[PDB]
Design a protein around this ligand. Structure first.
Ligand SMILES: O=C(N[C@@H](Cc1ccccc1)P(=O)(O)[C@@H]1CCC[C@H]1C(=O)N[C@@H](Cc1c[nH]c2ccccc12)C(=O)O)OCc1ccccc1
Ligand SMILES: [Cl-]
Ligand SMILES: [Cl-]
Ligand SMILES: [Zn+2]
Length: 583
């Protein structure tokens, strides 16, 4: 029993390193150059990894996990018993593989053109229209156009995807795919936990929603904005209305206090994509944390290719499973937004390197949310006026008005995201559990878009529309609740790391730069990887075991007070009692 289990673990680990390393590069070649050849080679490398997973997964299932003495060994074998997609019969496996590939390619090659012959890709073209245009009709063209081309074209694949991913999940002992996804957190109370955490941030979100709805009322006209209704989903400076910081100019609390154009400030002093990752590297090393290998700089795709290549532009960070080769792939634009994104990517990279000496089965974040949180934590300190001024991207800081402005900028990004990141997998769990059918995909999406976010589609939805398909993580099959957890827990990390750094006074003024006390708590948690249940890693960073929104609420507390006063003086109905309103 016990000695065979130890040998199995070792054999699995060394062989997976080879098989997963070979898969990583084939997958990289498809991502950095979408062709029919790299698509073929990947689908073939899917079959080799499936063979490995099946061989070792079948053998792991003959071990009684219950009889196993060693805790680490027992936790590995149990994980290896989950074949995931490899549990599918050969014919379904290759269909599910082609489906996943066809959804990725469809999303990534989608363009939106005018009759004049000019066509727009999502990054950077449609993305810039969403962020900078203040014309109702232009935003609507980019918003509808993206959903017409990407969303609609994903719909032919999705019901077959749901069937196959669910089947593989049943074959691994789960009730459905969303059940398999939720189990990554190892928390039976998970749904309740997240629901409570969502309700905690309701008052702060409803007040932000009401404040911004008024500002859109000012700008876009009383005829197009309902002050008791949902906000049209194309007016928030982002394609999915998931973050609202790009319309900051429309909502500035104190316009008498102008802040530098951080983007033109980056362009003015000749910031590059390379510079942005070099600065993220520096923030990571300032904490006493690992620098990126030299190899990283030679192998990563830090900017969008210009040699006429078709790519997956939605960013990702890569582990090639040898402990040396880690890469980022980003279609980077020189702005504050992608500087924050670069840090997110470098936190994934830092995580790979921190747990690189664990068995591969344990080479994961404490939970998926821990992995998304790490780069966002540093980025919170980066985005402070103090630190931005030190990068020469600002000129100051000080007055309670600059404070409210900075906090508003932060809330338009962080608070606005809470209902959205909660939504996606609420929709998807109900698609997976069978309660939402292909008949109700879209209607149920907008039902939740209304309920949680207070948004309405600017144009009524017709038959054949599949608006979830216009969002990366859906055709790409990436779980989303990881980002909801991340946004809550990053402020907990921030609060506790600020305490270690000896920050007194308001949390939003904290800048953990160069703190070896902050660095030590992240490194100690990250080195665990997936070895222990996550409340341990949570305890190690924050001195306690639970997820809480209190650290986030504390950070925005001065904004909540300002929003309440400001909304109360404008007589705003919080929420959307007239929910059925459509523009
Ligand atoms: O890079 C990814 N994952 C990403 C996307 C991906 C997943 C799977 C296959 C292919 C690609 P991303 O989250 O970095 C990633 C790439 C750019 C931002 C991130 C994102 O998606 N964010 C969400 C949420 C979001 C909105 N605004 C922001 C701002 C900052 C962070 C997140 C965020 C989004 O909808 O785009 O995976 C790293 C990893 C490997 C192994 C174990 C654990 C983690
Ligand atoms: Cl949508
Ligand atoms: Cl997840
Ligand atoms: Zn991420």
């Amino acid at each position: 029993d016990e000695a065979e289990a130890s040998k199995f673990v070792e054999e699995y680990d060394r062989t997976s390193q080879v098989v997963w390393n070979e898969y990583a590069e084939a997958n990289w070649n498809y991502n950095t150059n979408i062709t029919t050849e790299t698509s073929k080679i990947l689908l073939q490398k899917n079959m080799q990894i499936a063979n490995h997973t099946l061989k070792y997964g079948t053998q792991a299932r003959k071990f009684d996990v219950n009889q196993l003495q060693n805790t680490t060994i027992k936790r590995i074998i149990k994980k290896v018993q989950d074949l995931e997609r490899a549990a599918l019969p050969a014919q379904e496996l290759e269909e599910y593989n082609k489906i996943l590939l066809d959804m990725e390619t469809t999303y990534s090659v989608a363009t939106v053109c005018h009759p004049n012959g000019s066509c727009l890709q999502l990054e950077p073209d449609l993305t810039n229209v969403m962020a900078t245009s203040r014309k109702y009709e232009d935003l609507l063209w980019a918003w509808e156009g993206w959903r017409d081309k990407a969303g609609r074209a994903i719909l032919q694949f999705y019901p077959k995807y749901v069937e196959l991913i669910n089947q593989a999940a049943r074959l691994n002992g789960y009730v459905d795919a969303g059940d398999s996804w939720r189990s990554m957190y190892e928390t039976p109370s998970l749904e309740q936990d997240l629901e409570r955490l969502f309700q905690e941030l309701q008052p702060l979100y409803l007040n932000l929603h009401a404040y911004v709805r008024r500002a859109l009322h000012r700008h876009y006209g009383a005829q197009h904005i309902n002050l008791e209704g949902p906000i049209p989903a194309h007016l928030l400076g982002n394609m999915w209305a998931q973050t609202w910081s790009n319309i900051y100019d429309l909502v500035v609390p104190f316009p008498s206090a102008p802040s530098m154009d951080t983007t033109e400030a980056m362009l003015k002093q000749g910031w590059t994509p390379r510079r942005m990752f070099k600065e993220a590297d520096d923030f990571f090393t300032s904490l006493g944390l690992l620098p990126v290998p030299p190899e990283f700089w030679n192998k990563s795709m830090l900017e969008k290719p210009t040699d006429g290549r078709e790519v997956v532009c939605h960013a990702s960070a890569w582990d090639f499973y040898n402990g040396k080769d880690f890469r980022i792939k980003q279609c980077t634009t020189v702005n504050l937004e992608d500087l924050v994104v670069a840090h997110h990517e470098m936190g994934h990279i830092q995580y790979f390197m921190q747990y690189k000496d664990l068995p591969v089965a344990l080479r994961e974040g404490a939970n998926p949310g821990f992995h998304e949180a790490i780069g966002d934590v540093l980025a919170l300190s980066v985005s402070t006026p103090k630190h931005l001024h030190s990068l020469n991207l600002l000129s100051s800081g000080g007055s309670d008005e600059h404070d409210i402005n900075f906090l508003m900028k932060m809330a338009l990004d962080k608070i606005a995201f809470i209902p959205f990141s909660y939504l996606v997998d609420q929709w998807r769990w109900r698609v997976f559990d069978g309660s939402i059918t292909k008949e109700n995909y879209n209607q149920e999406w907008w039902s939740l878009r209304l309920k949680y976010q207070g948004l309405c589609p600017p144009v009524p939805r017709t038959q054949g529309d599949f608006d979830p398909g216009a969002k990366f993580h859906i055709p790409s099959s990436v779980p989303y609740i990881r980002y909801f957890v991340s946004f809550i827990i990053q402020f907990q990390f921030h609060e506790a790391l600020c305490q270690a750094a000896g920050h007194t006074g308001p949390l939003h003024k904290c800048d953990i730069y160069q703190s070896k006390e902050a660095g030590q708590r992240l490194a100690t948690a990250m080195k665990l990887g997936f070895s222990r249940p996550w409340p341990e890693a949570m305890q190690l960073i924050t001195g306690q075991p639970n997820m809480s929104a209190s650290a986030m609420l504390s950070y925005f507390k001065p904004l909540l007070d300002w929003l309440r006063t400001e909304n109360e003086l404008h007589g705003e109905k919080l929420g959307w009692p007239q929910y059925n309103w459509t523009p």
